[model samples]
Target: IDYQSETYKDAYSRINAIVIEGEDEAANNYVRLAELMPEQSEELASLAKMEARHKKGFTACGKNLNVTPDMDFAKKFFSDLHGNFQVAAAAGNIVTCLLIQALIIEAFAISAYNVYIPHADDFARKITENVVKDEYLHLNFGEQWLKANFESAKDELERANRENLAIVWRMLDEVAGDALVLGMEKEALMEDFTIAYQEALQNIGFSTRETLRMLTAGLAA
Candidate 1:
């Protein structure tokens, strides 16, 4: 990847912004979750702090590349997903909240970081590598909750996945072209997404058969 190329710079702008924006939202989600989660408030606050650092580290990567991220576009890209989260929050849907942020969103971040690391420039790769570590911790937090309550929480968990999964995929589709320019192809992205997503569902106690069914519905629908 030619980090200095016009094409790469252009793509990095949007991709980097989306990542930074995501970190910001991730932190905010944790904070909001903390407010509502009495059992895990302290832990959730710490997670929010982790996301704060992630945003800073990723922002520095953009600075290193001499790229200015497109914040406006990134916000537009995230608005619907963020709105859906608020819908869950408003309904006091703690499980849905955790699934969306810690499971659904974090899994995408992990898969994307894994795919992007190989293509990333030196500085960004290191930042992302460290960022990816915290992401799994974030993923595990939700995985544990859902897995523990799988039998009872099953319906809403499925419902949340159905509502939000397509939104996530479409966000990827919107950035597919830009991602390709950064050497992150659409096929690789989807491959990684499926792997990460199914693994999460499986960890949360969904059968392999069930996980695939849900993914197929999201992808096609």
Candidate 2:
């Protein structure tokens, strides 16, 4: 249940990271997610500088809105996803697989953020979406690191990345499906989800056909 326990997987997790240029949101999201790991305490401290830089970037973006973490959504997502983590932990799945999950989840996050960002009409919503972008980069750091490790071992790293990408797509589909469970009678939530997915697909350069596929999957099953 806690990161400090034997359940902590080094392969799937790490501490402290630098906030590089053009990836400030990823850095901020890193700080937020890293805070969950006790071993990442020092890394959390180091993220202060990163956050400062991110704030500056926000200012440059102009007409910025307030950005706050969505704790409610975070909690639900965490609980649902942690079920998978706990299963892996019990199975003694290599720290590698667990870390793989981390990366996959990040991909899901970025996918959702990409969907939301363009549809975000208000300044504040866009600001919040910006923070989500940074979170994906955080995921990338872990994923790329894992791929590097695989490369060093002379293993096929691209396969791992591709597999994780597939998992990300499935997760996105599942999230949309779950939302529809709250009484499908509400047009607003359904419409909101559809529009967001459409906008997200467009923003990310995905095709209309693919967008409809996601919607089809969401509405079906």
Candidate 3:
């Protein structure tokens, strides 16, 4: 079989190349975005602030342990996030983008916080807990905003917007591939992610377990 003839495989290669080459630039832009998120959406801004604090806690922990994260990994992590944010921003449907950003991204972040809270060493647990609180707030803010936005929007307009948002969601899903685990030493990051997913759905008065299962079952090229 000619791999290049497989449409998605070729596209995945191209996007991965973009992700690798643009990592440093993405990190710098993410800092700016982190600064801007608070103004654009206070809930997300709060999460970003918590993330800043987490960075500090990590720094302090490093001093005690005489250990530091790989600079390149830090670079790629921020880059992926920033790049995904831009993709969401460009969706051009406020409600749609908000759902993806607030519901999906923030929900995922909450999972990260939950996972790290217990698994983290003493110096980092508090920081992750604080972040989890903020992430839930972001999910609430975003989910409410999306519901309200859609309620008043015309059906055709809402449909168009949702389609764009879907593109962005699937785009990032493919971009993340199996790397949502963030290469931590933790053996069960997937479980952490699942818990976070459940928390978001429970908070929203829904169940997402089946959907999450389907989403995670896909093969990456």
Candidate 4:
């Protein structure tokens, strides 16, 4: 057995365990959203169901490698990410949680999974591909909802724009920064992330120039 290859696989296996937790949190959020927003219940419930499959897919990847993931680490990692939303959610603002999970965090996951594709083995690659596709679909729902909501509540949304943008940057700092520590190609991943995020924002009513400005402001010192 090639020790280096095994080590790489081992690292991803544990990471997938963390991904499972993230998916679970996503599903839970969707379920909550369905309860709070009955008009969007169908869409939210579908996303919740899809997240379960994503969690299962990650579990399968770990099993295929005959590696048991580090469950403790996975739980702790997700706790950090999920805990950020508890306060906003307690304030009963669903939009804040939606932006965090479906926009920022989901984009983070897409970029992370895209970066992992080239590094993954065949088994892992297939799993990542499927999950990435589903995540993109989920992001579309979020973008559409945000755009519609913002259009209806323009003044209120404008007031919170700065605060929400700061939250997005903070999420990028934590999630994308961690991918760098896990051997991702920073330049290429950043380029992909920039495009993905730019398009997502555009779909949600942000102008191209505005999106670029946000990216530059958040990413540059």
Show model 4 residue runs off by greater than 4 Å.
Answer: 1-6, 137-139, 152-183, 216-221
Give the TM-score of each candidate: 0.95, 0.38, 0.51, 0.79
Q: Which residue pairs does candidate 3 place in steric collision?
A: none
Q: Give all candidates' CA lDDT scores.
A: 0.87, 0.39, 0.43, 0.69
Which of 1 and 2 is ahead in lDDT?
1
- Better-scoring candidate (lDDT), 1 or 4: 1
Give one digit per residue, the lDDT tens place, for model 3 in 1-221. 12223343343233323333333342333344445444454445454454455455445543443443345543453454445456645653444345445555444445444643544556556655664565444446555544455435334223433343344334345435323332232335445554554454344433366335323432121
Question: What is the per-residue lDDT of model 4 for residues 132-161, given as tens digits with 9 covering 90 to 100?
Answer: 887765556766888888766444333334
Cα-lDDT of candidate 4: 0.69
Model 3 root mean square deviation, Cα atoms: 10.4
Whose lDDT is greatest here?
A: 1
Error of 1 at 122 (Å): 1.2
Q: How far is 177's C-alpha from truth in model 4 (Å)? A: 9.0
Clashing pairs in 1: none
Show model 1 residue runs off by greater than 4 Å: 137-139
